[PDB]
Symmetry: D2
């Protein structure tokens, strides 16, 4: 066990005044990775006053000065990629083959992107008449709060903190209690790059206490939350009741992958695998409802089974391992309950469905890669996000039907279609009710591409130019050079 | 009186199935203007199903076809300006001198503005590599809901419905129970202009029921609310708990008006008058904290007294009337309680402070134009929105001090400065924490200018190009033309 | 008809040149009208009129300008058929085209820009707490447009709409071949409430009236539509005189690529519309049709079947879809190109000569003409003909067709016909042209910027960007801090 | 002495095949700094084929890959700032107090700015109907040519190459024959940073041969030229006559500085000094027509003379030197002809008017700081750009008059106003016909700010986001998914 992990406030680690702690577990062994201090209500207020002071220094700097500091943070992240990836693997259970190639790399890509856009953040000017004009400023919100999830801890912290800092704000970040460690490292890296004290503070803790203290604080102007649909509704509600904060929410999904009647089934099966079993199924954007034409279903199932057999579970630091345990043991239990629900409702188990057993698996929160077929739109596993390695295969007959069924859900995060046909690809995608759409691929989320959910899957967007703007507030200023007329 | 007012669903007036009605009162005479049907839970569901069907027709039209229909609505509104203004006066008690020059004129201006921008609504295209690119669509939200306030009934209905419809949505509008009449007229006008049935439905009712049914409905994608700060928090919370709706909120303020030491005091007094006594003080953006340099306070007070003496209360249809009663007797009661708190807390009454009495006033909720001076930052009348004709005059000594005090509030809607000095005007305005800032003027809200609140005064914005975009949602589409690679 | 005058400051006025020219009806050979030609003094009058009007125009509110342009739109829709008939007499294009395309799409662009006027915005850039920058998009002032003869009224609208919408006054010179509809537009604009001087029309000869505009010191921009060679001279003269901003929409030799998986009925329909509309007198025409060798014979048969359905005749008849060429001198140039095709070894698939008989002997008719077995070195393949002459070329592989499609000084338009998702985007992204069509040809939405690569143009028309290109940026720095001198 | 300077083509120095050379002179001593090879027609053809090959490599990289390479060039330029400034001082005669603080600093600022914007370069997407949409690409022009001037050699090379390279083009740069040395250093710096071979080639030579050969070449897509008005017309003409190239031109001016009646005259005099005598008056944007109110003329003249007396000419590497010789002896002769016309036409000489003589000046191209007053709008020195240290003071009586006179010129590059009054500052500036306007300052040209001329002072702009886009060409693409209809 590491030394007791402290809070990060105003450029330094600092002891919590709450008197409370929590533990993070290595999901591959069950051992305690570390004891972590939990931020109390007084700790949150202290972090906010620190952030207010830092934000004023940060915002008073020039745009290019802020860009240079974020770019130095990028360089440090690239250099420390493997060290951070290893820590992320210990905390999350994700294979090093993933964490060393994706988590920090794509997190730093977004920070690098926004570092370069700071000088392009511009207001507007509007002429009204010769004697009057309007101009606008895109001003910082002030102090914002980001609340992270556990599947991509450092990536999420970068995707929230990068636009927030680039827009001139200070952010107080609360990582998930499951995976608090990499965010504390990120805080040191930012300071090492020259970020002014207070601009990025990290408050580990529990959602019911630390997260709620942030959502309630009167001087925080915005909350950005990544997490579950149910917890999101609570965060957004508490954020409104306290001080009417601006809100961004990235929640889960039940995204459909539509295989067209002209699709090559090797390509479709490869896309379905990457849409379901990367990060052991713990990805909000996963294509967990795979729609396949009835005439192809039997062949597609065989192609899925062959590729499931190639999945290589084992030591998370081994080069060939491409599948890990789930993030925690309680989470494994929920995934298993969904699997039992699939059996009890009559879905046909094609493969998996149980924990992994044997030396190297008995002490980890492993679930076998699991595929259900003969699925129907009313089944619990088809309707609800599992956030585990569980693919649901559904047969369909015609294009209009599959679009209706793909859209008949409260979720709206992602979608995809597999087809070589120009007209079919655009025609279908334009009709799907989702914010993130992939044609003949899955999963790639470039820094330039806004991503977020329709309907219950989210509020607002992340990434792209628009997210830099959404971390500012517009001030309109009218200059009246004419004589003002009063009717009184 | 008038005929019983029904609901407007799918291009026709229709009876409510709630079995409930309410009365709208003429605030100048006390007479029942009309009996109005109240939309029940089932009526809201009918309106949503109507809106869904109409929205599909609307969105499938070409952009210019939508533009032309809204422009026909503009032309009808210009032709009926005076008739609609007189109706607005009957329902609100605001003088015809105001309604015939502002309410419909500026409401129709915003509709004309967005009508012309529909064809300019564009997504983006982002090249990733030779073998892949991303493009974005700005898609309609679907069915959205507007909830109006009673001070500017038809203007609010136009400022919400114009961008929502121009963005390809259908809107269900709930007017305030105080002032439902003009919204029903607007619904007929839209139909007459060629708006497809269902695209604009109007559901009169009470906030506790009809408003709550809209915030709760699972198939409404966005709520846009104008009203008080307190009611706003309830709407925003209920929108999250039910279906995680996008939300826009335009709430009240306690906006500061800063008179600089080099200001001409006749101009300052004229601006203060217009910032406090228009629409009898029932304006969210009013400059109700008037900061005057200590050395000019006495002279400024004299100039206010002289201009207050010229305010002309009387017949609301006479050209020289420039002051009306408050919208209801309960609202006047609240304004009178604030005036009494001002007296009891030691503020000096400069003028007014009582109800108006005599023939032509006894049946209306009239309050005299009221000015308090010798005010301090801790007084109730200085800290809280009154929404009545009550100006608070505060003295200050230096620029840094006045900026602090101007910003030391939870409200953030508007602000202004009076100064002929180039540096002082821009320098002060840039430090003020408000979304709407006026230099040497007050009140003008051009269609091009985004307007909305900082902090507790609002979420999001109205008007400007950005509000058109905010009634769309982004879908990002990646076209991957290279061979997809699975790691499994 | 009545002797046609110049239009300056809201009225018809006699030219001071003492010179006139005649415009010929291309279907009968008869003189339609005698038109006065603007001299150097007339241009100076138009410019001073424009300077006075532009100030009135620019001082109005943005929405005031929008309403006036929208009222011109309403007048244009109501007089569509009348304007179309005049266009047919002057151009020779069938009424089936002029009543459905010329005024409709010209008015579409005017309607489009009318609505964007209030969205024209500058920027604001903070530098530090004590200094910021804001920009204005200011009118250029007086700008000049020089039209072509194939789409007289449409081109006048596509140039004047963004110019006026941006707050400028425009002096428009129509082609001497086709001056009549531009003068009608001038009246319509005035009837809509456009202030006097904001749109002046100066008919005349390119060698005189055009050159006087390109040389005038108080004109800030020249916008020219025409041939590549004429464009180079206009742009040079605009530079040598007063360093004007320039926009040029010139000709092309645009390629139409038929893919190996293309449906040949669709390909043939696209090739027909890309070659024989307006009798082949369209700058964006796909006059190089690349077809896979394995499909060439079938494609040739399908083209011939559709050429036989072409209906030449009375231009005011509903079923007529093919007209004479705009002038007899132009037909002479088109016939010389056809003879080179014959002499250089291209195989004549149909047409190749003038049309004869009652109703055709007195008009400047050329039959729909198709060459095949063409090679990249032939004159008919390398140079814009601007007549109804399709060249069919065979190809074997994708890389080859892209190299050959791009192997030209022209850069205006291009297209591909394919149902395959990857092939359509992949090929289009590599073609060196500004206007690219997938599984279609010819559509030019008001929202879509259009213009040429390489020798086919400078700048763009239509879309939001063209509104901005008719403004000039002024950057303004507000320095609220103390200024420090090193002296 | 330095080594014979060669051409830079495809990542290496290479001998010209023209057989021709020229010499660059140290303007402070008259000595030969270096012999420089002159590129002939064949060398130009080779550089274009090099550029075509390099441009393909550069454009096929990712946007962030291009961004990183330019950022490494920024880092090298910052580290080598003093060495580069010293070389520029030797080649131009500008004091090191200027070159080490401005030339490379602001040149590198612009490269840094555009490096970060590469990922934000985006096309558009326009929906037409359900069955068809349009998207646009911002494609590189290909090979572009920059032709520099001699007053700010390395800065001009950076301001032209930075947006051109950031947009994916290759640039062939021709420096002025007066000042070729720093451009060749920049080429090595770009290669050291990782710029692919051929993307930045430098061809020293004469305008009549090397300049003309580039403007004529069929495979160069755009010309960007900085220089005199007369040469500009010739460049723009040859660019059109050959292959109809896109053009950008930054030419000279006769920019007005308007001192208002309420201006502080010390501030006005400091601004006029910086607007006339920086770089010895060899700045295109200089405020050489100084309009002063008649009532303040005498006092303003006194304050100018006092500040002129502080000008410190001397050793160009000494810290306190703030005034240098002119760039060449032929240019001094032209400046002297203008000064003589000022005397002969009746303008009153307040100071200067002759060369500087004595030890340390006799071998340099020195002209004394010169001020004329009692100037009138018809004088040659008032109407024509001198590009030397010659200020013209003009008296005026009222605002309308000074605006007319300020605008009564074929030039349009810059302008400025000195006034503390809010209304006067914006009101006057909005009426001036110039692309670059300064209020209460002069000379600052932020990377974010587009700069360029009205009328004869230029075509197009430099700096700002718009200049990155102007180095691309728009391709519009319509996808028609519905059945195509032929009328034949
Ligand atoms: C561990 C597990 C229980 C999820 O944790 P949870 O307690 O349900 O919380 P959520 O993931 O919904 O919310 C994310 C974060 O919101 C915050 N949060 C929760 N309740 C909060 C509240 N009332 N106020 C403020 N913040 C709160 C916490 O920081 C939480 O981090 P956590 O994941 O460690 O709890 C897991 O078994 C699970 O259900 N995961 C499936 C998917 C999911 O619900 N969310 C993950 C991303 S979609
Ligand atoms: C520039 C030139 C080549 C144009 O060739 P062209 O297009 O065959 O010539 P045209 O006279 O038909 O010009 C076409 C259009 O440009 C117009 N035009 C010609 N000169 C113009 C000018 N200086 N300004 C404006 N418009 C001009 C013509 O009026 C005509 O308009 P319209 O036909 O639409 O009514 C020709 O005008 C010229 O100057 N010839 C001398 C050089 C030459 O022939 N080529 C040298 C080859 S090495
Ligand atoms: Cl050195």
């Amino acid at each position: 066990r590491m030394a007791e992990q402290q809070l990060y406030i105003h450029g330094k680690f600092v002891a919590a005044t709450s008197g409370k702690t929590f533990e993070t577990i290595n999901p591959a062994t069950g051992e305690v990775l570390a004891t972590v201090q939990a931020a109390g209500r007084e700790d949150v207020d202290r972090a906010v006053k620190s952030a207010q002071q830092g934000q004023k220094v940060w915002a008073a700097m020039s745009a290019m000065a802020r860009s240079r500091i974020l770019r130095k943070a990028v360089d440090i992240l690239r250099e420390r990629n493997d060290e951070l990836a290893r820590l992320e693997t210990l905390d999350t259970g994700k294979p090093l083959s993933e964490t060393a190639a994706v988590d920090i790399v794509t997190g730093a890509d977004v920070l690098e992107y926004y570092a370069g856009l700071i000088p392009a953040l511009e207001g507007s000017q509007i002429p009204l008449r010769d004697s009057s004009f309007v101009y606008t400023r895109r001003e910082p919100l002030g102090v914002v709060a980001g609340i992270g999830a556990w599947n991509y801890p450092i990536q999420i912290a970068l995707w929230k903190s990068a636009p927030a800092l680039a827009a001139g704000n200070a952010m107080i970040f609360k990582p998930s209690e499951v995976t608090p460690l990499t965010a504390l490292k990120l805080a040191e890296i930012y300071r090492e790059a020259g970020l002014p004290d207070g601009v990025f503070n990290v408050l580990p803790g529990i959602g019911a206490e630390t997260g709620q203290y942030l959502t309630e604080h009167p001087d925080i102007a915005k909350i950005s939350f990544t997490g579950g649909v149910a917890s999101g509704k609570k965060v957004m509600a508490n954020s409104a009741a306290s001080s009417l904060k601006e809100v961004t929410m990235e929640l889960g999904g039940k995204s459909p992958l539509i295989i067209a009647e002209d699709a090559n089934l090797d390509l479709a099966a490869d896309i379905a695998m990457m849409a379901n079993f990367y990060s052991s199924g713990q990805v909000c954007t996963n294509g967990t409802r795979v729609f396949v034409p009835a005439k192809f279903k039997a062949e597609f199932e065989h192609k899925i089974l062959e590729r499931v057999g190639r999945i290589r579970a084992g030591d998370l630091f081994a080069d060939d391992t491409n599948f890990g345990p789930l993030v925690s043991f309680p989470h494994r239990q929920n995934v298993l309950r969904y699997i039992e629900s699939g059996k009890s409702e009559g879905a046909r188990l094609l493969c998996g469905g149980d924990v992994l057993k044997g030396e190297g698996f008995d002490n980890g929160a492993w679930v076998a890669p699991t595929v259900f077929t003969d699925c129907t739109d009313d089944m619990t596993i088809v309707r609800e996000e599992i956030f585990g390695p569980v693919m649901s295969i559904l047969s369909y007959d015609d294009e209009a039907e599959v679009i209706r069924r793909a859209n008949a859900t409260e979720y709206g995060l992602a979608a995809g279609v597999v087809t070589p046909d120009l007209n079919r690809a655009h025609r279908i995608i334009h009709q799907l009710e989702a914010g993130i759409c992939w044609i003949n691929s899955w999963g790639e989320s470039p820094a330039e591409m806004p991503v977020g959910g329709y309907k219950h899957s989210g509020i607002g967007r992340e990434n792209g130019v628009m997210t830099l703007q959404s971390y500012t507030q517009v001030k309109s200023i009218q200059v009246e050079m004419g004589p003002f007329q009063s009717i009184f």
